[PDB]
Design a protein around this ligand. Structure first.
Ligand code: CDL
Ligand code: UQ
Ligand code: PC1
Ligand code: PC1
Ligand code: PC1
Ligand code: 3PE
Ligand code: 3PE
Ligand code: 3PE
Ligand code: 3PE
Ligand code: SF4
Lengths: 157, 115, 318, 172, 98, 51, 188, 70
C-alpha cells in the first residue's frame, strides 16, 4: 500500500503500546470483587509489574474497574466519576454484580449491570472472579486497545 | 547572560511541553467532564468560601522568625571582622532573644493550634 | 558550546528523573515482596517512556470553575524552577557559577511552593484547597528550620558558594562535625520535597490527590517531573553539602562518580523511607519542626557561632 | 543590554499598578511576588546580590502567609481579578498608556531630566573599584554586627516585642 | 539610574494611591502597604549600591525588619476584624462615628 | 445638634461593647467519599468542617 | 436520486439542529475565542429557526412508526424564527461572555472560512459552513412538520442552557434561565 | 531478585555522571585545556579582562609568558 499508510500504522502501534503499557485504574471499588482486586494488587500477581498502578483521582485514571454491586444510590456517583475521567478511558466490569446484577438482580435497589450506566469495555465473570481472572481481563483489555486503529481510521476518512 | 539564557531555555522547554500536551491529544469535553470533583457527588458549596486557619499565630510568628533569619544570614561575612568579641556577643544576644521569644510563645500556648 | 552544555545537563537530568520513577517502582516492589515493572522493556526500562507518552497523549482537563491562567501557569512554573534549581550545582564545576548559591536555592524552592499553592487555588476544588493549606503549613515549618540549619552549616563553611563547600570537604566530610544538623537537614529535605512521611499535599489516603486532584495528563506529568527532579536535586544538594566526594584537580571524573554514587544512595534512602514509614499528621509535622528541631537548631547555631571563635578556625572569605 | 534596567523598572511599575488596582488578594500577592522578583533583579543589576535575594526570600515568606490569610478570611465567592471589572481593566490599560505618554513627554519636553532615552544605559554603574576584594553588598550588612550594634539591637527588640505584641493581639 | 529612580518613585506613588483609595478588602490595603515598603527598599538599595555606601547598607534590612513587624501586626488586626464580623470589610469597620 | 443626616445616630454604649447580630458559622461541607481511598468505596461521609 | 431509486422514501428536511454536541450553538459560542463576531451584514437579513435535536429524533422515530408519513417530505423547524444577529446576541447573552459584532463581507468571510477549512483534522469552519450560516431559512408553508409527526417543537429559549452553560466562566456558571433576555423573533 | 533494580540504577548512574563530566570537559575545551576562570571578586574579574586585553586575540585563556618579554 501507500508509504504513508505504513507510517500511520506504526504510529498507531506506538500509541497503542503506550496506552496499554500505562493503564492506571481509579481507586474505586464497591465490594468483595474489590477485595479480589486488591488481592490482584497483592505481591503474587503484581499489577504494578504489569504496569497497572492505582490512582485515586479519576483525572489521572485511564481505566475504571467496576468491582462490586452498583446500587441505585451509587449509580449517579459512578456515572460522575466515570464522566470526570479524561477521554482515553476504558471500563472493566468485574463480577456478576457489575456484569448483570448477579445475586441481587431482582432487587429493588440494584442496577442490573453497570452497562446500564457506563459503556463497559470488558466483562470479567465470577463471584468473585479470582485475581487471576481479573488479571486476565486486564491483559485482554491491553490486547483490545492494542487492536485499536485510530490514526488509520483518521487517515482513511 | 548565561544564567538568563538557561532560565529562558527552561521556560521554553516547559512551555513547549505544556503546549504539545494541550494541542496533541483529541479533545472531547462536556459539562460532566469539566464539573469539579467531590468524590462522585455535587459540591454542596463553592470552594471559594472562607476556610478557617488554625495556625495563623504560627504564621505571624513565622514572619517574625523569617526576618530573624534575614538578620542572622550575614554571619558568614560577619565572622571575618576584626572585633570578633562584639560580633560574637551580638550574635549570642540575637539568638538568645529569638529563643526566649520562642519559649515564651510555647509557654503561652501560641504554638498550639486553635480548637 | 554553552547551549550544548545546557542540553547535556538538562536531558540527562530528565532521563535520570524518569528512571528514578522506574527505580522507585522497583525498589518499593522488592521491599513489598513483589517485583515491580519488568515487562515494559527488557527489565522495565521502557515503563517511564510508556507512562510519559500515555500522559502526553491523554487529554487535559479544563474545569469550568477553574481559573485557567493560574491553572496553566503553575505546572510549567514548577518544572522551570526544578531545572533552575538544578542549574548551579557543581559536579565539581557548575554550569552557572554563583556566589550566593544556597540563597538562590532557597528562593527557587519557595517559588516552587508558590507553584503548588497557585495550582491548588486555581483548581477550584475543596481537596485542592486542603492541599494548598497543608503546603502552607509544611513550608512554614521546614522553611524556618532549614534556613537556620543551612546558616549554621555555611557558617562552618565560610561562604555561600558551593565550590567553597568542595574545598571545605577536601579533607573530611561535614557529616562528622555537623551530623545532628545533617539529620535535621535530611528531614527538612524530605519535607521540602514532600516525600513520605511529610508529603501531605498529594495526600493519597487523607485527601484524594490534594493539590493536583483536578490536574490530568500533561500538566500532571509536569508536576510529577518537577517533584522527582526535586528529589534528585535535594539529595544531590545533601551529598554536596555534607558527604563531600573526593576532589582532585587533575581529574574531576572521580568527583562526578563519587557524587553520583552518594546521590543514588540518598535517593534510594528516600524510597526506603517512603516504604518504611506511615504518614505524619500535618499539625504534628509543624509541632515537630517547631518544638524539637527548632530549639536544637538555634542552640547549634549559637554553638557554630562560638566554635570558630574559640578554636581560631574562622573559615577563609574565599 | 542597555535598556535592561529600564525594562525591569517598567515591569516593577506595572506590577505596582496592578497591586494598586487591587484585585482579589491572591492576585495581589501574585503581583507583589512578581514585583519582588523584579526588584531583586534590579538590585542584582545595580550591584550586590545579597539585598535582592534577601528581599526576594522575605517577600516569598510574606506572600505565603498572605495567601494563607486570604484563603482564610479575606476571600469571596467570586474573586475579583483585573479582567472581571471593565473599570479595573480600563484603569489598567489607561495606566499603561499614561506611563508611555509620561515617559515620552519626559523624553521630548524635559530633555535630560529624569528620563533620557539616548542617555539610557549610560548611567547605571557610576564608579566601581576595578581591582579589589571585600566589595560585595553583604559585607555592610555583616558590618551591622560590628559597626551598627544599635541597629542590630533595635531590629532584634522589634522582633521580640513583635512576638509579644502579636500574642497579645490574638490572645482573644 | 535616574530613569530607574523615577520609575521606582512612581511605583511608590501608585502604591500610596492604592493605599489611600480603599476598596472593600483590608488585605488589599495591607498589600498596597507592602508594595510601598518594597519600593522603599529598592530605592534605598539602589541608592546605597550607586553611592557605594556599605555603611548605610544595613538600613534597607532594618526597613524590611520593621515593615515586616508592621505587616505582622496588620495581619493580627485583620484576624480580630474577621473574628468580629466574618469579613475584612472596611465598610463593616464603621461604627465609631457615634 | 441633630440634623437630617445625623438624626439616625445613637449614643455610644456605656461599656463600648456593641450588641452585634450573631453571624452564622459558615462551615465547609465536604463529601468524603464514596470515591475515596479512605471511605472504603461506598461511604458518603458528609463532613461539616471548621478549617 | 433517493426519490428515483426508492419512490416512497420519507424525506426529512430539518433546519439548523441545535443540541449538546451540535456545531451550531457550540460554533457560535466558540466564536468567543476570537476578538469579535464577524457576521455578514451585521447578522441582519438572515433568518433562522433552529430545531432541537431531541425533537428531530422524535420526529424520525415517529416517522418509522407513522403510517401516513410514507412518501412525504417533512420540514423540521423550531417554533420561532430569529435574525442571525439576535440569535448570536442571545447565544452570547446566555454565555454571559461578551458581544462585539463586526460586519464582514461575504467574499472575505468565505476566504477565511476556506483558510480554516484547509486543515487535516476537523476544521473549525469552512466556506460551505459560513455560506450555510448566511443562507436564510425558508418558511415551510406546504410541507408537514413536527406537529404533523406528533412532536411539539421545544423552544431554543427553553433548551438553550443545557448547551451554553459549558462555555461560561466560573463567575456566571450558576446563572438561571431568566437572567438572559430572550431574542426578538421575526414573523417572516 | 534484588539485582533486577541494577539496570535502572545503572541508567540513573550514567545519567548522573554525564552532566558533571560533560561540564568539566566543555569548560576545558572552551578555555583551551584549562579550567574556566572564576571571578568571584572584582580583582579576579580585572585579572581576566587584563588577560583578554594582553592576549591580542580577545580571549583571556590565551596566556602569554616570557615570549612577550625581550
Ligand atoms: C500562561 C497561559 C495564559 C492563558 C491561560 C488560558 O487558557 O486562559 C484562558 C483565556 C480564555 O478565558 P476563559 O478560559 O474563557 O475564561 C476562564 C478563565 O479562567 C478566565 O481567566 P482567569 O479567571 O484566570 O483570570 C485571568 C486574569 C488573572 O490571570 C492573571 O493575572 C495571569 C497572569 C499573571 C501574570 O487575568 C486578567 O484579568 C488580566 C491580567 C493581565 C496581566 C496583568 C497586568 C496587571 C498586573 C501586572 C503584574 C502581574 C503579575 O485565554
Ligand atoms: C473491606 O472494605 C473495603 C475497603 O477498605 C479496606 C476498601 O478500601 C474498598 C475499596 C478498594 C479499592 C479501591 C481497591 C484499591 C486497592 C488498594 C488500596 C491496594 C493497592 C495499594 C496501593 C494503591 C498502594 C500502592 C503503593 C505503591 C508504592 C505503588 C507506587 C504508586 C505510585 C502512585 C507512585 C509511582 C508513580 C506512578 C505509577 C506514576 C509515575 C510516572 C509518571 C507520572 C511519568 C512521568 C514521567 C515523565 C513525564 C518523564 C518525561 C520526560 C522525558 C525526558 C522522557 C523521554 C521520553 C522519550 C519518548 C524519549 C472496598 C470496596 C471495601 O469494601
Ligand atoms: C517528550 C515527552 C512527551 C512525548 C509525547 C509523544 C510524542 C510522540 C507522539 C506520536 C503520536 C502523535 C499523534 C498522537 C495523537 C493522539 C490522539 C489521537 O489518536 O487522535 C485520533 C484522532 C482521530 O480523529 P478523527 O478524524 O478520527 O475523529 C475524531 C473525532 N471523533 C472520533 C469524535 C469522530 O486524531 C488524529 O488522528 C490526529 C492525528 C495527528 C497526528 C500528528 C502526528
Ligand atoms: C500537532 C498538534 C497541534 C496542532 O495540529 O495544532 C493545530 C490546531 C489543533 O487544534 P484542534 O484541537 O482542533 O486539533 C485537532 C485535533 N487533534 C488534537 C487530534 C489533532 O488547529 C488545527 O488543527 C486547525 C486550526 C485551523 C488550521 C488552518 C490551516 C493551518 C495550516
Ligand atoms: C544526610 C545525613 C544522614 C541523615 C540521616 C539519614 C538516615 C536516617 C533516616 C531515618 C528516617 C527518618 C524518617 C522521618 C522521621 C521523622 C521523625 C523524627 O525524626 O522525629 C524527630 C525526633 C522527635 O522525637 P519525638 O517527637 O519522638 O519526641 C517527643 C517530643 N515531644 C514530647 C516534645 C513531642 O527526634 C528529634 O527531634 C531529634 C533530632 C536529632 C537530635 C540529634 C542530637 C544529637 C546529640 C547532640 C549533642 C548531645 C550532647 C551535648 C553536649 C553534652 C556535653 C556534656
Ligand atoms: C536561655 C534560654 C534559651 C536556651 C536555648 C534553647 C531554646 C529553647 C526554646 C524553647 C524552650 C521552651 C521550654 C519551656 C516549654 O515551653 O516547655 C514545654 C514543655 C511541655 O510542653 P509540650 O512539649 O507541649 O508537652 C506536651 C504536653 N505535656 O515542657 C518541657 O518539655 C519541660 C522541660 C523541662 C526541662 C527544661 C530544660 C532543662 C535544661 C537543663 C540543662 C542542664 C545542663
Ligand atoms: C513561567 C514564568 C516564570 C517566572 C519566574 C522565573 C523564575 C526563574 C528561576 C528562579 C529565579 C530566582 C531568582 C534568581 C535571581 C538571580 C540570582 C543570582 O544570584 O544571580 C546572580 C548571578 C551572578 O551574580 P553573582 O553570583 O554575584 O556573580 C558575579 C560574579 N560571577 O546572575 C546574574 O546576575 C544574572 C541576572 C539575571 C538572572 C535571572 C534571569 C531571569 C530571566 C527571566 C525569567 C522570566 C521571563 C519572563 C516570563 C516569560 C514568559 C513566561
Ligand atoms: C538499592 C539497590 C539494591 C542494593 C544495592 C547494594 C547491595 C549491596 C549488597 C552487599 C552488602 C554487603 C554488606 C555486608 C555483608 C557481609 C556481612 O557480614 O553481613 C552481615 C553484617 C551484620 O552481621 P553482624 O555480625 O550481625 O553485625 C553486627 C555488627 N554490625 O551486615 C552488615 O554489617 C551490614 C552493613 C551494611 C548495611 C547496609 C547494606 C545495604 C546498603 C544499601 C541499602 C539500599 C537501600 C535502598
Ligand atoms: C488620580 C486620583 C483620582 C483617581 C480616581 C479613580 C476612580 C475612583 O474614584 O475610584 C474609586 C474606587 C473605589 O473603590 P471601589 O470599591 O472599587 O469603587 C466602586 C465604585 N463605587 O477606587 C479604587 O477602586 C481604587 C483605585 C486605585 C487606582 C490606582 C492606580 C490609578 C492609575 C490611574 C491614575 C489616574 C490617571 C488619570 C489620567 C487622565 C488622562 C490623562
Ligand atoms: S459478584 Fe459476588 S463477589 Fe463480586 S461484588 Fe457481587 S456478591 Fe461480591
Amino acid at each position: 500500500r501507500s508509504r504513508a499508510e505504513y507510517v500511520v500504522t506504526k504510529l498507531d502501534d506506538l500509541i497503542n503500546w503506550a496506552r496499554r503499557s500505562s493503564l492506571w485504574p481509579m481507586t474505586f471499588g464497591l465490594a468483595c470483587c474489590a477485595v479480589e482486586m486488591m488481592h490482584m494488587a497483592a505481591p503474587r500477581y503484581d499489577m504494578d509489574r504489569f504496569g497497572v498502578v492505582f490512582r485515586a483521582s479519576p483525572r489521572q485514571a485511564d481505566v475504571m474497574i467496576v468491582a462490586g454491586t452498583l446500587t441505585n444510590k451509587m449509580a449517579p456517583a459512578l456515572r460522575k466519576v466515570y464522566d470526570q475521567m479524561p477521554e482515553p478511558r476504558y471500563v472493566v466490569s468485574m463480577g456478576s454484580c457489575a456484569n448483570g446484577g448477579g445475586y441481587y438482580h431482582y432487587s429493588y435497589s440494584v442496577v442490573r449491570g453497570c452497562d446500564r450506566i457506563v459503556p463497559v469495555d470488558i466483562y470479567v465473570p465470577g463471584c468473585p472472579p479470582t485475581a487471576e481472572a481479573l488479571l486476565y481481563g486486564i491483559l485482554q483489555l491491553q490486547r483490545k486497545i492494542k487492536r485499536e486503529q485510530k490514526l488509520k481510521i483518521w487517515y482513511r476518512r | 547572560m548565561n544564567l538568563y539564557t538557561v532560565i529562558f531555555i527552561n521556560i521554553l522547554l516547559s512551555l513547549t511541553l505544556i503546549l504539545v500536551a494541550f494541542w496533541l491529544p483529541q479533545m472531547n469535553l462536556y459539562s460532566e467532564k469539566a464539573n469539579p470533583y467531590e468524590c462522585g457527588f455535587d459540591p454542596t458549596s463553592s470552594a471559594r468560601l472562607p476556610f478557617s486557619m488554625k495556625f495563623f499565630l504560627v504564621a505571624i510568628t513565622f514572619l517574625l522568625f523569617d526576618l530573624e533569619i534575614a538578620l542572622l544570614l550575614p554571619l558568614p561575612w560577619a565572622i571575618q571582622t576584626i572585633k570578633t568579641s562584639t560580633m560574637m556577643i551580638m550574635a549570642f544576644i540575637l539568638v538568645t532573644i529569638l529563643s526566649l521569644g520562642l519559649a515564651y510563645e510555647w509557654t503561652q500556648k501560641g504554638l498550639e493550634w486553635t480548637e | 558550546m554553552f547551549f550544548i552544555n545546557i542540553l547535556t545537563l538538562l536531558v540527562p537530568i530528565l532521563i535520570a528523573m524518569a528512571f528514578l520513577t522506574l527505580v522507585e517502582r522497583k525498589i518499593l516492589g522488592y521491599m513489598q515482596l513483589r517485583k515491580g515493572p519488568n515487562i515494559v522493556g527488557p527489565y522495565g526500562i521502557l515503563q517511564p517512556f510508556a507512562d510519559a507518552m500515555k500522559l502526553f497523549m491523554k487529554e487535559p482537563m479544563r474545569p469550568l470553575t477553574t481559573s485557567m491562567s493560574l491553572f496553566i501557569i503553575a505546572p510549567t512554573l514548577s518544572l522551570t524552577l526544578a531545572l533552575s534549581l538544578w542549574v548551579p550545582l557543581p559536579m565539581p564545576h557548575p554550569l552557572i557559577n554563583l556566589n550566593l548559591g544556597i540563597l538562590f536555592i532557597l528562593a527557587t524552592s519557595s517559588l516552587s511552593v508558590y507553584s503548588i499553592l497557585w495550582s491548588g487555588w486555581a483548581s477550584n476544588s475543596k481537596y485542592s484547597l486542603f492541599g494548598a493549606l497543608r503546603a502552607v503549613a509544611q513550608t512554614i515549618s521546614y522553611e524556618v528550620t532549614m534556613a537556620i540549619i543551612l546558616l549554621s552549616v555555611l557558617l562552618m563553611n565560610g561562604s555561600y558558594s558551593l565550590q567553597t563547600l568542595i574545598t571545605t570537604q577536601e579533607h573530611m566530610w561535614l557529616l562528622l562535625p555537623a551530623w545532628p544538623m545533617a539529620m535535621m537537614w535530611f528531614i527538612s529535605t524530605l519535607a521540602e520535597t514532600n516525600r513520605a512521611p511529610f508529603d501531605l499535599t498529594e495526600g493519597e489516603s487523607e485527601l484524594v490527590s490534594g493539590f493536583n486532584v483536578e490536574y490530568a495528563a500533561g500538566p500532571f506529568a509536569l508536576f510529577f517531573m518537577a517533584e522527582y527532579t526535586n528529589i534528585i536535586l535535594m539529595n544531590a544538594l545533601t551529598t554536596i553539602i555534607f558527604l563531600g566526594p573526593l576532589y582532585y584537580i587533575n581529574l574531576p571524573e572521580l568527583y562526578s562518580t563519587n557524587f553520583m554514587m552518594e546521590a543514588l544512595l540518598l535517593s534510594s534512602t528516600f524510597l526506603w523511607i517512603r516504604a518504611s514509614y506511615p504518614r505524619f499528621r500535618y499539625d504534628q509535622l509543624m509541632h515537630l519542626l517547631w518544638k524539637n528541631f527548632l530549639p536544637l537548631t538555634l542552640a547549634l547555631c549559637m554553638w557554630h557561632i562560638s566554635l570558630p571563635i574559640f578554636t581560631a578556625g574562622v573559615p577563609p572569605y574565599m | 543590554m542597555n535598556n535592561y534596567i529600564f525594562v525591569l523598572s517598567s515591569l516593577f511599575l506595572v506590577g505596582c499598578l496592578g497591586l494598586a488596582l487591587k484585585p482579589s488578594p491572591i492576585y495581589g500577592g501574585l503581583g507583589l511576588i512578581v514585583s519582588g522578583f523584579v526588584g531583586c533583579l534590579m538590585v542584582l543589576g545595580f550591584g550586590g546580590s545579597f539585598l535582592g535575594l534577601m528581599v526576594f526570600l522575605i517577600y516569598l515568606g510574606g506572600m505565603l502567609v498572605v495567601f494563607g490569610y486570604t484563603t482564610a478570611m479575606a476571600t469571596e465567592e467570586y474573586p475579583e481579578t483585573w479582567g472581571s471589572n471593565w473599570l479595573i481593566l480600563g484603569f489598567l490599560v489607561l495606566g499603561v498608556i499614561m506611563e508611555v505618554f509620561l515617559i515620552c513627554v519626559l523624553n521630548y519636553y524635559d530633555e535630560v531630566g529624569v528620563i533620557n532615552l539616548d542617555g539610557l544605559g549610560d548611567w547605571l554603574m557610576y564608579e566601581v573599584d576595578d581591582v579589589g576584594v571585600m566589595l560585595e553588598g553583604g559585607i555592610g550588612v555583616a558590618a551591622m554586627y560590628s559597626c551598627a550594634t544599635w541597629m542590630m539591637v533595635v531590629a532584634g527588640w522589634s522582633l521580640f516585642a513583635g512576638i509579644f505584641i502579636i500574642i497579645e493581639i490574638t490572645r482573644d | 539610574m535616574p530613569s530607574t529612580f523615577f520609575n521606582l518613585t512612581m511605583a511608590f506613588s501608585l502604591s500610596l494611591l492604592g493605599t489611600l483609595m480603599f476598596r472593600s478588602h483590608l488585605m488589599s490595603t495591607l498589600l498596597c502597604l507592602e508594595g510601598m515598603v518594597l519600593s522603599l527598599f529598592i530605592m534605598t538599595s539602589v541608592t546605597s549600591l550607586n553611592s557605594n555606601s556599605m555603611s548605610s547598607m544595613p538600613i534597607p534590612i532594618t526597613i524590611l525588619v520593621f515593615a515586616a513587624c508592621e505587616a505582622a501586626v496588620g495581619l493580627a488586626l485583620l484576624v480580630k476584624v474577621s473574628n468580629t464580623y466574618g469579613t475584612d470589610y472596611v465598610q463593616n469597620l464603621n461604627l465609631l462615628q457615634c | 445638634y441633630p440634623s437630617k443626616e445625623t438624626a439616625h445616630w445613637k449614643p455610644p454604649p456605656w461599656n463600648d461593647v456593641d450588641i452585634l447580630k450573631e453571624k452564622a458559622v459558615t462551615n465547609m461541607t465536604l463529601n468524603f467519599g464514596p470515591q475515596h481511598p479512605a471511605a472504603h468505596g461506598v461511604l458518603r461521609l458528609v463532613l461539616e468542617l471548621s478549617g | 436520486e433517493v426519490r428515483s431509486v426508492f419512490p416512497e422514501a420519507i424525506i426529512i428536511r430539518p433546519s439548523d439542529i441545535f443540541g449538546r454536541e451540535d456545531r451550531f450553538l457550540n460554533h457560535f459560542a466558540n466564536y468567543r475565542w476570537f476578538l469579535a463576531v464577524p457576521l455578514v451584514s451585521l447578522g441582519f437579513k438572515t433568518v433562522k429557526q433552529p430545531v432541537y435535536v431531541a425533537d428531530v429524533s422524535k420526529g424520525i422515530v415517529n416517522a418509522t412508526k407513522d403510517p401516513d408519513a410514507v412518501g412525504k417530505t417533512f420540514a423540521f423547524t423550531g417554533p420561532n424564527r430569529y435574525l442571525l444577529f439576535h440569535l448570536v446576541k442571545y447565544i452570547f447573552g446566555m454565555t454571559h461572555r461578551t458581544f462585539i459584532p463586526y460586519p464582514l463581507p461575504l467574499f472575505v468571510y468565505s476566504w477565511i472560512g476556506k483558510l480554516f477549512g484547509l486543515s487535516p483534522f476537523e476544521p473549525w469552519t469552512t466556506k460551505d459552513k459560513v455560506e450555510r450560516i448566511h443562507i436564510s431559512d425558508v418558511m415551510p408553508t406546504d410541507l408537514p412538520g413536527l406537529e404533523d409527526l406528533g412532536v411539539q417543537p421545544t423552544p431554543l429559549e427553553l433548551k438553550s442552557i443545557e448547551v451554553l452553560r459549558r462555555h461560561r466562566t466560573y463567575r456566571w456558571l450558576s446563572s438561571e434561565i431568566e437572567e438572559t433576555k430572550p431574542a426578538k423573533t421575526v414573523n417572516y | 531478585m534484588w539485582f533486577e533494580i541494577l539496570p535502572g540504577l545503572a541508567i540513573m548512574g550514567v545519567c548522573l555522571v554525564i552532566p558533571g563530566v560533560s561540564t568539566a570537559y566543555i569548560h576545558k575545551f572552551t578555555n583551551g585545556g584549562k579550567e574556566k576562570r572564576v571571578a568571584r571578586v572584582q580583582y579576579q574579574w580585572y585579572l581576566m579582562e587584563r588577560d583578554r586585553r594582553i592576549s591580542g586575540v580577545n580571549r583571556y585563556y590565551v596566556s602569554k609568558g616570557l615570549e612577550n618579554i625581550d
